[PDB]
Design a protein around this ligand. Structure first.
Ligand SMILES: CCCCCCCCCCCCCCCCCC(=O)OC[C@H](COP(=O)([O-])OCC[N+](C)(C)C)OC(=O)CCCCCCCCCCCCCCCCC
Ligand SMILES: CCCCCCCCCCCCCCCCCC(=O)OC[C@H](COP(=O)([O-])OCC[N+](C)(C)C)OC(=O)CCCCCCCCCCCCCCCCC
Ligand SMILES: [Fe+3]
Lengths: 69, 149, 486, 99, 51, 74, 488, 86, 125, 99, 122
């Protein structure tokens, strides 16, 4: 039956603006800082911590530290 | 192998790179000037067309020579500083040439980052291999010489 | 009762539908559904005759594809691919049952495309040849792209199909380079010889890098997950069901089968890399699922997070970790299919996806509310559910291997209990918005029946996962024991 | 002018004669070669008739097809007979006749 | 060469050229601009002849 | 499946594909379908026989290449 | 018929049939007794019959083509490689003739001289494939070149046809001059024209050195001429313009038939005679350029004929990677790729001629084809995916075997560039498939049904393409045998 | 909650990843394809010029390759090509 | 036509036209529904996605706006069309298309009446 | 010395045809003329090489190249005539409809 | 509120290449290309799909500067098509594609010019 939602123009515009955020990127200072912190620095720190955990396991086992990329 | 071939002291390397970049830029500028048509009002006259061609030759030669010289110089200085040659030794030199020379031409940081990344990837891509089209040496490709075993 | 027969069952129905006029929509629907159900029963009969003791591939069948160059077609199963075969064969009839009401507009091409996709899936999962496995791996690209483009809701389906095709093509092409290099090195593409042959450490690293790129295109990782939410949003509900419970599982299957045992040293070298990628993807994708406005996007990002949990559970090279990875693969296929079915039901009733319009569906759709609550619980991995079984086994393996990555993965529990609850409350709990939506209808008989097998499967695999676990311990043990000889 | 009849590939069957004359090859035509000639000529004539209906020249089209088919069928029959007589083909019957 | 090139092909070219009645400024271009590229290509070909 | 019946099925499918390609009914001119099945059967049989012959020729040429490379050694 | 001419029965029959067809067509088209009938259809049917008959002659007389080995050695040498190449060429010519029949009646193109030139050019390509000397090579190349000049400029009042004819004229004459200079340099610095003599003189000594600089230049110029003949990017600029301007049957014939003949000629002049790493390096650079610029330019095209031309350029680049490896597997891959590309091009141009009834020009014209002509939409999408290299279809077989030959080649750079280009150039095929299936244009271009001549050929080609992955052993074995028989 | 949209989605998923992914790739490939298509100017003189450059480059880089390799480097040549392509 | 537009009768795709429709110089845009006893005089156009019920007559030069339902012996607007009702026009068009396909299968390419006329000729002589 | 002078002259004629093609941008008949000059240089090279090498292949192939050049000149002037009649002018900017 | 078509009728004028004055009648919302095709001074088969991708400047019309101010300015795609598909690669600054000229009562009475027709067959 006639079950279609009563579409609101402003709600639809909000949805389209949300799904079209790729046009609004401008490499501003905030965007650059966020990319450099949460896109590079945090993954690098996580990788270093994981490698450190593996190397600590190697030291406790007495083996020779493993080789990672 | 390539290092063992010739001595090629770094200053001479840089001079040779700058000279060949200048030659290639001159050739490319001549090609571009002859490819692009003259305006309608300039069809009757020939001296303005020749002057425009010469200016394009000079511009392209100068920019290509600058790119080559900067790239080779940065690579040589990095090699001297690190006392060794690696993939990143010439990869950084390509980025500097694009960021400084091509970046100044575009008058924008984004072009410098874009052009520098493209040159750095190209320099590293060729240096990733042995700068050889074919990387297989065990294949014979031709049976000419007999062998005992 | 053979794998060749299993592969050929969709082909006969597909041909029959191709040679039937489009005006006989009732006959087309009935024949397609009958073929799908017959194939499902045939796969079940294959199940009641599976030996979980041996490590060799069970129903090996050889066909002469190329007499030279050793690229003969080998069809076989060992225990890991088997549940995926069953999952695809079960999920295909659900896709036909979904479009039952308006199938005349869809046409027979819809059922034909889904049957061809089923044929391709069974061919992929039943394969002991690397080159032919890649052939069907990239064959699955045609039907899904056509489905997304043709039966998409809006004009963004074109961009979604383009992104899907280009990403998968790039990955498959690099995999093809690696596979051809392996073929030239070994003299054959046979899986047994490829497993029993050595590779140089540099060669192992390069081949593993190519395979990882190819499979990480399929299983969404941090840089290459952005094509998946758009694909689910723009694909129809059945296409989303397939892409969520079938193709990503294909990718992780290919990765687990051809990367971990073939290149042990490379996997050990790159293990922290995938751990950090998976932890970052889980955290970031759960957090970006929290702030979403589209239902399809929410479940697609949940798919990304759970697939990254799967790939964080494989390199925990132990029985618990790998078994949990496989179990959560099956469970997430079922749960993603069910959640996308719920969202498709909502879209079919009310042609919108934004949760702003929805709210207070308890008063009008109580059966749908109960089903949605159960499947949000399954996505949340409540204890007593297959997703919980898989997630806890994965976390056990991750804690036995690397405590830091285990804790990072376990941080996903809090985030997955956040967006699931908050979405469920938005859509189902609250008061009706009569200005937006004022006509409602609860789940009908067809949809209720469609949801029945999902509930039964989830409950059976959660309460008593012994059958599924015991059907794969031998293969898991042999896979972990492949590299070593001690 | 010097002419050499030697072929690169050796015949796989006994050779009745390396360079049989044209009249001998024509006289070697068995019933199968005549069937070849007849079938080719008939195919050509039928094709010519069926294609010349639209232009309106049925007689001329059949005549042209007949010349083309006669040439092609005679060439094919001569080819088969010569290949048999030089041992390139399974010439059991004329090998027996020679023996 | 006389009979064919001088006779046949050259009377053909002459007939077609005169019958066209091509006017100036319809086929007209300054040659100074192409002098550098012509010189470079000719010098490359001459160097190859040298080698 | 036999080669003859595989070829018959292929020819029937090709004929019905051609019929459907011009918006004609699938089974228009059934005698053309019979001719198509016959042509497909003979095509598959001849293809298999010619494949066997060319495989024998390829084996012969591989043996020739092996002998030629064997003649390298002193 | 004296027994030496057993070696030339196919060519002699095709020449005599061409003469008979020309005489019949002229005498019954200049006839006032009738209404000056359009004899294009009758002459085309008779030419297709003649092509079939000479194909039968060449196929049945497999060992008889070798008769008078030393007598014909000056002009041409026939073996299994040339036998299979000529069989494929005759099949392609027959398909092109059959699929262009409906163009004649509907478009009123009623010049039987088109069919006469088809037959004469086919004989020229036969002579080229058999050719074993620097003179017969040039004669056959020039014969097909003049035939193709007349073919491209066939539509006299058409501005596009005249411009395409003039361009193809000038550029082909330039390439002929370059190839002639190369032949002259080789003759002057070698003393030899026969391929056997060139092989004997050249083997054992590399072409890159102080000695044999003239030989190197001659070989390079001949390679330049051959590369122009196959539309490599350094010399490709004619292919799109003439392919668009010339009538669609003419451009289909140009895209299908000359490729195999020129590539067999290249194999017999370069792989056998002047085999040396510098030629493979030249063709490696040409293949890189061909793939890269074909993909880049076809991404920006919006016309079906131009897109087909650039796809042909890219697939020639892939055939060039197969050549530039220059091994047994490399040559086998080259032959596999040529066969698959010829089949796919026949398929695509048959579909294009089917859509020519309503004068399809742009990619958008075939929009909403999934509704008006469903099975045609699926067929053309299958062809586009085959061009892409999707596994289940025939194009992927040639694709991965080319890449395998490149991996055993040692040319990792070449293989990586090829695969990146394969990913890049998928976009315009996908755009075509989108236009048929995904778009919902405001207005639709309804397409008239096909003719049976195109329909049967299209059905057979589509069945071969779709079901080739079930049985590629015959083609693989044949190409391997041809590559092995190139030398011994 | 802010990280879910301000960083993870807008700054990474719809930001750097997409700008350096499908969006920027699409724009760059569109402009590169347009520039390549500009080469086919429809001029017989342009086509003959392209043929002449092809022949001259082949001659210079193969026949004169001894002195050319003694002077220039492959890395430098390809870097100049890329810089010309911008 | 009275509207100076081209007067050829054009009926675009997905247009259902009832039993006793009297159409003259109409310009029916695609996806239209027209009931029986409907008359469309010269110069009339029914725009895309529109419905005219049974018995409606449009005067020459009168247009039926897109997305609307019209009725009455003089054409008059009744109510706007919801999207769900609009989407059903192609479904109706393809439904009568399927019924037409069902009707189509009963006719062989060539009639057998020539046998009857030959029998009549033989009976006469 | 004579061979050196003849080869130098032929190479200079080849380069001069190249220069004609290069300089004649808006002129097309002179481009065809430069192509014909290239053909003449090729013929002269073949003849002088035959004379120097005491081999008759150069003369044979020079005669064949003459025949081919004459035929291609006939065809080319046909194309020129039909083009000029179609567009009414020989200017290059009227022959740029395909791009 | 009779909802006739005379309100949607937009009447404009066109001078074709040889200078003959023509009267062109087209509906509002229907493009100038469609109006000219209906009038008969543009080949209907030359331009069928009213799309920028399918337009090869066969719908090009020169419009007066005092009329260019009444319709939206040329898009980048339109300018690119005009530049590429021209005798000389220049912009005429008075010509616009007939596909993108949406007729309306604001443009009613506009005078356009049809240049020399171009061939389109293959
Ligand atoms: C035995 C196998 C071959 C059978 C061929 C049957 C006839 C085919 C030609 C024909 O009549 O086409 C009719 C069609 C249509 O003819 P038509 O339209 O004039 O026939 C209907 C006539 N009215 C309307 C008055 C009832 O004609 C063509 O297609 C053009 C001529 C084709 C000629 C083909 C010749 C070679 C055929 C294969 C030979 C092997
Ligand atoms: C059991 C089946 C027995 C069939 C016996 C042969 C029937 C031939 C019918 C005929 O005249 O077809 C002509 C028509 C001519 O085509 P047409 O386009 O002129 O159509 C006329 C069709 N009829 C016969 C109904 C007037 O042939 C075809 O349509 C294709 C024939 C293919 C070859 C068939 C014979 C086998 C070889
Ligand atoms: Fe337009």
């Amino acid at each position: 039956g006639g079950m279609e939602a009563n579409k609101n123009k402003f709600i639809e515009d909000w949805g389209t603006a949300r799904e079209n955020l790729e046009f609004n990127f401008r490499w501003t200072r905030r965007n650059l800082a966020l990319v450099g912190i949460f896109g590079i620095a945090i993954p690098v720190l996580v990788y270093k911590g994981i490698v450190r955990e593996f190397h600590m396991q190697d030291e406790d086992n007495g083996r020779p530290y493993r080789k990672f990329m | 192998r390539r290092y063992l071939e010739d001595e090629d002291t770094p200053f001479m390397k840089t001079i040779k790179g700058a000279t060949t970049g200048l030659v290639a830029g001159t050739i490319w500028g001549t090609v571009v000037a002859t490819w692009y048509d003259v305006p309608r009002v300039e069809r009757s006259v020939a001296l303005p067309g020749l002057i425009r061609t010469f200016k394009m030759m000079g511009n392209y030669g100068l920019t290509f020579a600058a790119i080559g010289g900067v790239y080779i110089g940065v690579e040589q200085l990095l090699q001297n500083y690190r006392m060794k040659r690696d993939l990143v030794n010439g990869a950084v030199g390509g980025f500097v040439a694009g960021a400084t020379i091509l970046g100044y031409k575009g008058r924008s940081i984004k072009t410098a980052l874009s052009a520098g990344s493209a040159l750095a990837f190209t320099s590293a891509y060729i240096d990733f291999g042995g700068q050889t089209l074919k990387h297989d040496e065990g294949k014979e490709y031709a049976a000419y010489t007999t062998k005992k075993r | 009762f053979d794998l060749s027969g299993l592969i050929l069952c969709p082909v006969l129905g597909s041909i029959i539908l191709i040679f039937i006029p489009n005006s006989r929509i009732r006959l087309i629907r009935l024949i397609g559904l009958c073929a799908s159900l017959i194939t499902f029963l045939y796969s079940l009969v294959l199940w009641i005759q599976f030996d979980p003791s041996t490590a060799k591939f069970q129903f090996v069948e050889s066909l002469r594809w190329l007499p030279y160059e050793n690229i003969n077609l080998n069809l076989g199963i060992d225990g890991l691919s088997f549940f995926f075969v069953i999952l695809t064969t079960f999920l295909i009839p659900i896709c036909i049952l979904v479009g039952w009401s308006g199938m005349r507009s869809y046409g027979k091409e819809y059922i034909i495309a889904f049957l061809i996709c089923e044929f391709l899936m069974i061919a992929v999962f039943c394969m002991l040849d690397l080159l032919l496995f890649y052939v069907f791996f990239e064959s699955v690209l045609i039907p899904m792209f056509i489905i997304i483009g043709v039966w998409g809701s809006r004009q963004r389906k074109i961009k979604a199909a383009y992104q899907f095709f280009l990403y998968t093509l790039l990955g498959s092409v690099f995999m093809l380079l690696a596979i051809l290099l392996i073929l030239f090195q070994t003299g054959t593409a046979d899986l047994q010889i490829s497993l029993t042959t050595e590779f140089s450490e540099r060669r192992q690293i390069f081949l593993w890098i190519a395979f990882f790129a190819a499979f990480a295109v399929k299983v969404p990782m941090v840089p290459v997950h952005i094509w998946l939410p758009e694909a689910h949003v723009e694909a129809p509900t059945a296409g989303s069901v397939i892409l969520a419970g079938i193709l990503s599982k294909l990718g992780t299957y290919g990765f687990l089968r051809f990367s971990i045992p073939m290149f042990p040293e490379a996997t050990l070298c790159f293990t922290p890399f995938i751990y950090t990628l998976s932890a970052i993807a889980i955290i970031y994708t759960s957090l970006t699922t929290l702030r979403q406005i589209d239902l399809k996007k929410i479940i697609a990002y949940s798919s990304v997070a759970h697939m990254n949990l799967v790939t964080i559970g494989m390199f925990s090279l132990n029985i618990q970790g790998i078994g949990g990875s496989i179990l959560l693969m099956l469970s997430h296929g079922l749960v993603l299919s069910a959640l996308f079915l719920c969202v498709g039901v909502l879209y079919d009733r009310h042609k919108t996806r934004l949760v702003r319009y929805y709210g207070g569906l308890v008063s009008t759709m109580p059966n749908f509310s109960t089903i949605f609550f159960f499947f949000t619980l399954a996505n949340m991995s409540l204890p007593g559910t297959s997703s919980f079984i898989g997630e806890f086994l994965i976390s056990v393996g991750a804690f036995q291997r690397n405590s830091l990555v285990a804790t990072l993965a376990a941080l996903g529990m809090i985030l997955g209990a956040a967006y699931s609850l908050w979405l469920y409350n938005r859509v189902v709990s609250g008061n009706l918005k009569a200005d937006f939506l004022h006509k409602f209808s609860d789940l009908n008989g067809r949809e209720v029946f469609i949801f029945i097998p999902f509930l039964v499967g989830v409950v059976r695999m959660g309460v008593h996962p012994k059958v599924f676990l015991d059907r794969m311990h031998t293969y898991v043990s042999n896979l972990v024991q492949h590299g070593k000889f001690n | 002018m010097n002419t050499d009849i030697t072929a690169s590939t050796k015949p796989e069957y006994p050779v009745v004669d390396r360079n049989p004359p044209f009249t001998k090859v024509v006289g070697n035509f068995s019933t199968l070669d005549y069937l070849r000639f007849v079938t080719i000529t008939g195919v050509s004539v039928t094709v010519g008739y069926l294609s010349g209906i639209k232009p309106g020249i049925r007689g001329p089209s059949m005549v042209t097809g007949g010349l083309i088919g006669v040439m092609g069928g005679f060439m094919y029959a001569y080819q088969n007979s010569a290949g048999r007589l030089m041992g390139f083909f399974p010439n059991d019957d004329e090998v027996a006749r020679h023996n | 060469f006389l009979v064919v090139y001088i006779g046949a092909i050259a009377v053909l070219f002459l007939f077609v050229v005169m019958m066209f009645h091509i006017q100036i400024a319809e086929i007209h271009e300054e040659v100074l601009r192409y002098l550098p590229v012509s010189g470079i290509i000719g010098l490359i070909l001459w160097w190859e002849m040298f080698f | 499946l036999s080669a003859t019946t595989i070829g018959a099925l292929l020819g029937l499918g090709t004929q019905m594909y051609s019929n459907a390609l011009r918006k004609l009914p699938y089974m228009r001119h059934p005698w053309e379908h019979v001719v198509g099945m016959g042509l497909g059967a003979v095509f598959v049989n001849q293809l298999l026989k010619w494949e066997a012959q060319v495989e024998q020729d390829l084996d012969k040429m591989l043996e020739k290449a092996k002998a030629a490379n064997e003649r390298r050694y002193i | 018929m004296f027994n030496l001419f057993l070696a030339v029965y196919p060519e002699i029959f095709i020449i005599n049939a061409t003469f008979i067809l020309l005489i019949h067509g002229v005498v019954f088209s200049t006839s006032k007794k009738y209404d000056y009938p359009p004899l294009v259809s009758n002459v085309g049917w008779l030419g297709l019959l003649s092509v079939l008959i000479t194909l039968l002659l060449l196929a049945a007389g497999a060992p008889l083509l070798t008769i008078a080995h030393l007598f014909r050695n000056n002009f041409f040498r026939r073996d299994n490689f040339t036998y299979f190449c000529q069989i494929l060429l005759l099949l392609s010519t027959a398909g092109t003739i059959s699929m262009c029949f409906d163009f004649f009646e509907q478009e009123r193109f009623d010049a039987f001289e088109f069919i006469v030139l088809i037959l004469l050019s086919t004989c020229s390509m036969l002579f080229m494939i058999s050719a074993y000397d620097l003179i017969a090579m040039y004669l056959a190349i020039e014969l097909q070149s003049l035939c193709f000049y007349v073919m491209a400029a066939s539509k006299r009042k058409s501005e596009f046809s005249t411009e395409a004819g003039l361009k193809y004229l000038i550029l082909g004459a330039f390439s002929s001059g370059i190839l002639l200079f190369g032949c002259s340099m080789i003759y002057g610095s070698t003393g030899a024209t026969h391929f056997d003599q060139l092989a004997k003189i050249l083997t054992g000594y590399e072409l890159a050195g102080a000695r044999s600089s003239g030989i190197f230049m001659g070989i390079l110029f001949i390679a330049v001429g051959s590369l122009f003949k196959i539309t490599a990017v350094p010399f490709h600029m004619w292919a799109p313009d003439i392919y668009e301007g010339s009538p669609t049957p003419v451009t289909a014939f140009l895209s299908i038939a000359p490729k195999i003949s020129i590539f067999a000629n290249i194999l017999r002049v370069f792989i056998y005679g002047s085999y040396g790493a510098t030629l493979q390096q030249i063709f490696c650079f040409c293949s890189i350029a061909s793939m890269i610029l074909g993909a880049l330019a076809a991404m920006a095209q919006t016309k079906v004929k131009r897109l087909l031309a650039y796809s042909s350029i890219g697939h020639v680049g892939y055939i060039c990677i197969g050549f530039s490896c220059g091994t047994i597997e490399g040559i086998q891959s080259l032959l596999i790729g040529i066969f698959i590309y010829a089949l796919m091009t026949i398929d695509a141009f048959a579909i294009v001629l089917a859509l020519r009834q309503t004068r399809v020009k742009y990619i958008a014209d075939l929009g909403a084809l999934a509704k008006t002509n469903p099975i045609l939409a699926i067929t053309f999408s299958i062809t586009m995916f085959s061009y892409v290299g999707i596994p289940p279809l025939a194009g992927f077989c040639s694709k991965f075997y080319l890449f395998f030959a490149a991996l055993g080649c040692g040319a990792y750079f070449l293989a990586s560039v090829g695969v990146v280009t394969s990913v890049i150039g998928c976009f315009y095929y996908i755009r075509l498939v989108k236009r048929m299936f995904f778009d919902t244009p405001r207005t639709w271009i309804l397409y008239e049904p096909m003719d049976r001549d195109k329909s049967l050929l299209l059905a057979m080609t589509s069945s071969f393409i779709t079901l080739f992955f079930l049985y590629p052993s015959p083609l693989f074995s044949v190409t391997h045998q041809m590559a092995l028989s190139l030398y011994l | 909650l802010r990280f879910g949209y301000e960083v993870s989605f807008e700054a990474l998923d719809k930001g750097a990843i997409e700008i350096l992914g499908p969006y920027g790739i699409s724009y760059t490939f569109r402009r590169l394809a347009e520039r390549i298509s500009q080469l086919q100017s429809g001029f017989v003189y342009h086509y003959a010029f392209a043929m002449l450059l092809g022949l001259t480059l082949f001659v210079t880089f193969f026949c004169m390759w001894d002195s050319l390799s003694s002077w220039v480097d492959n890395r430098s040549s390809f870097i100049l090509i890329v810089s010309s392509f911008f | 036509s009275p509207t100076g537009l081209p007067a050829d009768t054009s009926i675009e795709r997905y247009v259902t036209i009832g039993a006793y429709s009297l159409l003259r110089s109409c310009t029916i845009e695609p996806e239209c529904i027209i009931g029986q006893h409907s008359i469309l005089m010269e110069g009339s156009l029914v725009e895309t996605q529109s419905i005219l019920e049974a018995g409606s007559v449009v005067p020459p030069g009168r247009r039926i706006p897109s997305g609307e339902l019209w009725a009455g012996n003089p054409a008059r607007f009744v109510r706007t069309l919801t999207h769900e009702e609009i989407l059903e026009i192609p479904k109706l068009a393809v439904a009568i298309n399927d019924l037409s396909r069902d009707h189509y299968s009963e006719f062989l390419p060539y009639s057998t009446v020539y046998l009857e006329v030959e029998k009549f000729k033989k009976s006469l002589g | 010395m004579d061979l050196i002078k003849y080869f130098t002259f032929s190479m200079i004629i080849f380069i001069l045809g190249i220069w004609g093609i290069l300089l004649n941008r808006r002129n097309i008949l002179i481009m065809l003329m430069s192509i014909e000059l290239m053909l003449l240089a090729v013929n002269s090279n073949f003849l002088v090489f035959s004379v120097s090498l005491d081999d008759m292949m150069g003369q044979l192939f020079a005669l064949l190249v003459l025949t081919v050049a004459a035929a291609e000149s006939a065809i080319g002037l046909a194309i020129f005539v039909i083009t000029f009649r179609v567009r009414g002018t020989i200017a290059v900017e009227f022959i740029n409809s395909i791009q | 509120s009779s909802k006739k078509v005379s309100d949607r009728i937009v009447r404009l004028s066109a001078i074709d290449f040889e200078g003959k004055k023509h009267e062109v009648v087209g509906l509002a919302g229907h493009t100038l290309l469609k109006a000219l095709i209906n009038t008969g001074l543009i080949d209907p088969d030359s331009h069928r799909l009213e799309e920028i991708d399918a337009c090869s400047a066969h719908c090009e019309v020169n419009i007066a500067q005092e009329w260019l101010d009444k319709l939206p300015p040329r898009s980048y795609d339109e300018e690119y098509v005009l530049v590429r598909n021209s005798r000389a690669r220049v912009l005429n600054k008075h010509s616009r594609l007939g596909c993108q000229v949406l007729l309306d009562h604001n443009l009613q009475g506009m005078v356009v010019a049809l240049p020399e027709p171009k061939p389109w067959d293959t």
